């Protein structure tokens, strides 16, 4: 029987709740800069494309499923299923990062930079900090997959997998808020 709370999970939950207030600053800056826009909020050089941000968002929304499948495999004692699903998750995350980088290059070429405008500052700051969190998540995947083959698959390793999944479900839920508030509510 199980009759205790997992404290490795409560620790990560409270930390993830605290980390939500970090993005509060970025959201505040965005909404403050948007207010003093006057006319068109995205200025003349800025042209947002939905031809690249939509597929990337869909990929970042398909990673959670695979991640949860890996977690489901973890709870049974399956060490191989976890590895397969986590590798797929890693690849999808890498796709997200490369897509975002490509969009950055495209935007910079047409004259939307950090020192160029007030829009550019907030846009790049918010999306760059999110990218940094994603890279941290990828590093976590690599570290966990490296640890899964050091020793026998004990419940502690399953707990580690579950908490890493928690973290991932926090990088893709904060990107559906940003995508909704940037590309739709302009």
Partner 1 sequence: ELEARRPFPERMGPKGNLIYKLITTTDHKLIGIMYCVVCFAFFLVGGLMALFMRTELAMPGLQFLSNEQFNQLFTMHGTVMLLFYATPIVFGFANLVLPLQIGAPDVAFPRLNALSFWLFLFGALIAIAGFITPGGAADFGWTAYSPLTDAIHSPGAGGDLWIMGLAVGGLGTILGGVNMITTVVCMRAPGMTMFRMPIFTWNILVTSILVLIAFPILTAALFGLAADRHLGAHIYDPANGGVLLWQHLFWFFGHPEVYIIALPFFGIVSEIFPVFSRKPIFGYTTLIYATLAIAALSVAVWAHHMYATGAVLLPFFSFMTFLIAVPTGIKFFNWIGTMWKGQLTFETPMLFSVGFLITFLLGGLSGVLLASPPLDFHVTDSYFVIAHFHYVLFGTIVFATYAGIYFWFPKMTGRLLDERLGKLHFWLTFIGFHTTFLVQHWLGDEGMPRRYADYLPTDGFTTLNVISTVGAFILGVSMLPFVWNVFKSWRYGEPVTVDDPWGYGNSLEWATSCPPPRHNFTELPRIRSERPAFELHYPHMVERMRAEAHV
Partner 2 sequence: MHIEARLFEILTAFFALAAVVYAVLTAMFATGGVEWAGTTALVLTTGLTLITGTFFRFVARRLDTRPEDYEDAEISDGAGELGFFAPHSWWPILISLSFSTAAVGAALWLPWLIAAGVAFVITSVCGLVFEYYWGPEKH
Ligand X SMILES: CCCCCCCCCCCCCCCCCC(=O)OC[C@H](COP(=O)([O-])OCC(O)COP(=O)([O-])OC[C@@H](COC(=O)CCCCCCCCCCCCCCCCC)OC(=O)CCCCCCCCCCCCCCCCC)OC(=O)CCCCCCCCCCCCCCCCC
3-state per-residue secondary structure call for the chain: CCCCCCHHHHHHHHHHHHHCCHHHHHHHHHHHHHHCCCCCCCCCCCCCCHHHHHHHHHHHHHHHHHHHHHHHHHCCCCHHHHHHHHHHHHHHHHHHHHHHHHHHHHHHHCCCCCCCCHHHHHHHHHHHHHHHHHHHHHHHHHHHHHHCCCCCCCHHHHHHHHHHHHHHHHHCCHHHHHHHHHHHCC
Rule CB under 6 A: which of 29-88 touch ligand X? 87
* Nearest distance in Å: CB 31, partner 2: 4
* Nearest distance in Å: CB 65, ligand X: 19
* Nearest distance in Å: CB 127, partner 2: 17
Regarding 28 and contact with partner 2 (CB under 8 A), the answer is: yes
Rule CB under 6 A: which of 117-176 touch ligand X? 132-133, 135-136, 139-140, 142-146, 149-150, 156, 160, 163-164, 167
Choose the contact partner of 118 out of partner 1, partner 2, ligand 7PH, none; CB within 5 to 8 A by kind.
partner 1
Rule CB under 8 A: which of 131-170 touch partner 2? 139, 143, 146-147, 150-151, 156
C-beta of 11 vs 101, nearer to partner 2: 11
Binding positions for partner 2, rule: CB under 8 A? 2-5, 10, 13-14, 16-18, 20-21, 23-24, 27-28, 31-32, 34-35, 139, 143, 146-147, 150-151, 156
């Amino acid at each position: 029987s199980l009759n205790r709370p997992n404290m490795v999970s409560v620790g990560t939950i409270v930390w993830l709740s605290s980390e939500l207030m970090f993005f509060a600053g970025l959201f505040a800056m965005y909404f403050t800069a948007r207010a003093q826009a006057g006319g068109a909020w995205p200025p003349e050089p800025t042209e947002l494309n939905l031809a690249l941000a939509v597929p990337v968002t869909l990929v970042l929304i398909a990673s959670s499923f695979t991640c949860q499948m890996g977690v489901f495999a973890a709870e049974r004692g399956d060490v191989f299923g976890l590895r397969r699903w986590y590798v797929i998750t890693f690849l999808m995350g890498l796709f997200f990062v490369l897509g975002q980088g490509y969009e950055y290059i495209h935007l910079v070429e047409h004259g939307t930079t950090i020192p160029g405008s007030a829009y550019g500052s907030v846009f790049y700051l918010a999306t760059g900090f999110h990218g940094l969190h994603v890279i941290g998540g990828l590093v976590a995947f690599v570290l966990l997959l490296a640890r899964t083959k050091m020793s026998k698959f004990t419940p502690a390793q399953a707990t580690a997998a579950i908490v890493v999944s928690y973290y991932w479900h926090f990088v893709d839920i904060v990107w559906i808020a940003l995508f909704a508030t940037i590309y739709f509510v302009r």
